[PDB]
């Protein structure tokens, strides 16, 4: 009777039961298959561990579903193996990326109703769920995950599509970048486990410098910023300025040969695409969500950068929940548990009479 | 499974099943009891026919319920004897007069749920139902019944209470007036059947003169306006100018010693109490409802009178449906049959948890 909540990230799938504090299952959004076959398939952690012999595929690219066969395998796995429930017995809330095409929204709807035979269904924009998680209906969300970074201005519960900004730079790019600078220091990371070590170094030692320039030299004249990382093999290594240099890419994409404005400028740009009367509320409700916004110092650095771009008189406020790795999921969990949401679900009956194009009509 | 629709008029109760073209039962809103007892009671037609030995009571005065014990007897009669259905098996839609006190709305709710054990309930303003009958959500309704005449401006489905005007002159007053002028012509009407004859003369021979003054003299210099009325006893009588003089009271209450503006001025006054931006739409959607607006010539006379009060540039339009005797009822029948209304009913469950004060909250 509990609704299921599934947040399909480019890198990680977060799944669980509506009403729960956190996702019961969090695993890689990967489908693995032996190199030329076309077990015939592996999903998540298992596909990851069997990397050496499989061809891994990510059905979600920059938040958009690009491989429907593989997406269905992930969904099937999520219900049956992770949550261990039959989908036909539960309302299902799925999430989608901002600016998701209408064809993609209908295909998702069709699969859920026709393939998994769900009794009730709903699709929510990820950034909006993060906003709801923070207990707001108006604000601007910065959602930085593994595949994509979006800036989503939301007014009275509805995102403003004309102002949505997408930055195709996220956690995956940061891991690869740390892997490059670490590699040039004389270390070797090329295997799965090694790449996982770099990702672990990133999530544990990395931080956003309040002042990059001043921080850099502080590592030049001292060993004050150097931390030692004990490898799984016992061997210990020293990571220095790569600590703050890797996440800096968010503010200066140029560091990865990327010709794009940083997260601070994109947030301003987005706010500026909104109606004047709403801007003040947006500046005062800048919500951070996603694994990639977990860097210590990011909120303090965004507050400074936005303050510098906004009018002097403007009250800028950054909201960075400690649970933001799962803010999208939590938002869905809250939404699908509300007494008030129970009339919002698309029913099987409704789908049967109007078809998948109902998803757009049903919207709210 | 059909909802019941009951329009409780001061003079006539109109009852039937939602979806039906017209009320299946239309009978006097009277409760009769033998003079000093305090069958112990008679309702409707029977109470009327046993007039000589009973004390008749009208639990509805000028559209407002004033005797709850007697109202319950009418309701009980309506369900069990007229409609011949058990109320606990059907959603019930009841109507109420404009400006009905909140205590009266809650008492009605309490009786329906606690006494008749209805499974679902709703209370609608009579004038709004008449507007819906005409297929509109915006307009100004003139509802003239037996006990009261109201002018109700409605915008986007909601009446504007600050602009509602009540004129305590209606059909009962017109019958009594015709009974007086006919009596002074040398005829005698004092018994029930005689009074019923006058009411029949009123509903069959009376009309609204386009120009009272010019009409009067046309009856002075000719017998062109005189109609003969064949009494039940075979005896035939001649009714002359009383034909147009009796309904004229609507435009000039002074004729009954009443110091009040006529229906035309009250309509203008009401429109004038509304927001400017809405006035144009009101003038263009003047809807007539109730038995008392059935007089031939009334719409043509209202069009003329309103035209004279409104700005020269104003498009004035009077809507006088031929079925207006039952417009309130029909409006309820339509409303309660709409697929869209099915979520609007107050449930027994809702009443049980929140009590009768829910009626105000549930409103729409």
């Amino acid at each position: 009777t509990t609704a299921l909540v599934c947040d399909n990230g480019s890198g990680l799938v977060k799944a669980g039961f509506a009403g729960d504090d956190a996702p019961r299952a969090v695993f890689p959004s990967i489908v693995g298959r032996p190199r030329h076959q076309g077990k015939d398939s592996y999903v998540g952690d298992e596909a990851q561990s069997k990397r050496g012999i499989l061809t891994l595929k990510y059905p979600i690219e920059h938040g958009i579903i690009t491989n429907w066969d593989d997406m269905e395998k992930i969904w099937h796995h999520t219900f049956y193996n992770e949550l261990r429930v039959a989908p036909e017995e539960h309302p299902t809330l799925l999430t989608e990326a901002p600016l998701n095409p209408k064809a993609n929204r209908e295909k998702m709807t069709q699969i859920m109703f026709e393939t998994f035979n769900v009794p009730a269904m709903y699709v929510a924009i990820q950034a909006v769920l993060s906003l709801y998680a923070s207990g707001r209906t108006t604000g601007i969300v910065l959602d930085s995950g593994d595949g994509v970074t979006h800036n989503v201005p939301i007014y009275e519960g509805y995102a403003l599509p004309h102002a949505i900004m997408r930055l195709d730079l996220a956690g995956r790019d940061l891991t690869d970048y740390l892997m490059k600078i670490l590699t040039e220091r004389g270390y070797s990371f090329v295997t799965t486990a090694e790449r996982e070590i770099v990702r672990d170094i990133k999530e544990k030692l990395c931080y956003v410098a309040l002042d990059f320039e001043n921080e850099m030299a502080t590592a030049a004249s001292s060993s004050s910023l150097e931390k030692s990382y004990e490898l799984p093999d016992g061997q210990v290594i020293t990571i220095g300025n790569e600590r703050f240099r890797c996440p800096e890419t968010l503010f200066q994409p140029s560091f990865i040969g990327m010709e794009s404005a940083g997260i601070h400028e994109t947030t301003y740009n987005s706010i500026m695409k909104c109606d004047i009367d709403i801007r003040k509320d947006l500046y005062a409700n800048n919500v951070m969500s996603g694994g990639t916004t977990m860097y210590p110092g990011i909120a303090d650095r965004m507050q400074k950068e936005i303050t510098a771009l906004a009018p002097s008189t403007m009250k800028i406020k950054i909201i960075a929940p400690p649970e933001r790795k799962y803010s999208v999921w939590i938002g869905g969990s809250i939404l699908a548990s509300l007494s008030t949401f129970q009339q919002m679900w698309i029913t099987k009956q409704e789908y049967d009479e109007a078809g998948p194009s109902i998803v757009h009509r049903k919207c709210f | 499974t059909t909802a019941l629709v009951c329009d409780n008029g001061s003079g006539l109760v109109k009852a039937g099943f939602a979806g039906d073209d017209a009320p299946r039962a239309v009978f006097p809103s009277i409760v009769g009891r033998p003079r000093h007892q305090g069958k112990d009671s008679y309702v409707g037609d029977e109470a009327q026919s046993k007039r000589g030995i009973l004390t008749l009571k009208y639990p509805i005065e000028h559209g407002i319920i004033t005797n709850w014990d007697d109202m319950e007897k009418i309701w009980h009669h309506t369900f069990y004897n007229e409609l011949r259905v058990a109320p606990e098996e059907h959603p019930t839609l009841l109507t109420e007069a404009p400006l009905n006190p909140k205590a009266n709305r809650e008492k009605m709710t309490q009786i329906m749920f606690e006494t008749f054990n209805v499974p679902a309930m709703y209370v609608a303003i009579q004038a709004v139902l008449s507007l819906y009958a005409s297929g509109r959500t915006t307009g100004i309704v003139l509802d003239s019944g037996d006990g009261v005449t109201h002018n109700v401006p409605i915008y986007e489905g909601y009446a504007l209470p600050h602009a509602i005007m009540r004129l305590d002159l209606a059909g009962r007053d017109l019958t009594d007036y015709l009974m007086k002028i006919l009596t002074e012509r040398g005829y005698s009407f004092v018994t029930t059947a005689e009074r019923e004859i006058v009411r029949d003369i009123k509903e069959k021979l009376c009309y609204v003169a386009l120009d009272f003054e010019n009409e009067m003299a046309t009856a002075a210099s000719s017998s062109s306006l005189e109609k003969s009325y064949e009494l039940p006893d075979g005896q035939v009588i001649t009714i002359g100018n009383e034909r147009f003089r009796c309904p004229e009271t609507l435009f000039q209450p002074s004729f009954i010693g009443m110091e009040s503006a006529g229906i035309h001025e009250t309509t203008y006054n009401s429109i004038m109490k509304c927001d400017i931006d809405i006035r144009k739409d009101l003038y263009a959607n003047n809807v007539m409802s109730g038995g008392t607006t059935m007089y031939p010539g009334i719409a043509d006379r209202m069009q003329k009178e309103i035209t004279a009060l409104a700005p020269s540039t104003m498009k004035i339009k009077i809507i006088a449906p031929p079925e207006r005797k039952y417009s309130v009822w029909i409006g309820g029948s339509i409303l309660a049959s709409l697929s869209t209304f099915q979520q609007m009913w107050i449930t027994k469950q809702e009443y049980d948890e929140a009590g009768p004060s829910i009626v105000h909250r549930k409103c729409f």
Binding site: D20, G135, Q343 | -
Partner: peptide, 25 residues
């Protein structure tokens, strides 16, 4: 008007009110 707001506004009001979610075990 003592009228409860739109179903969508009731949803927004409840989102702003916030709900306690059950601990994970």
């Amino acid at each position: 008007r003592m009228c409860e707001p739109s179903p969508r506004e009731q949803l927004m009001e409840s989102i702003r009110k916030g709900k306690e979610l059950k601990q994970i075990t």
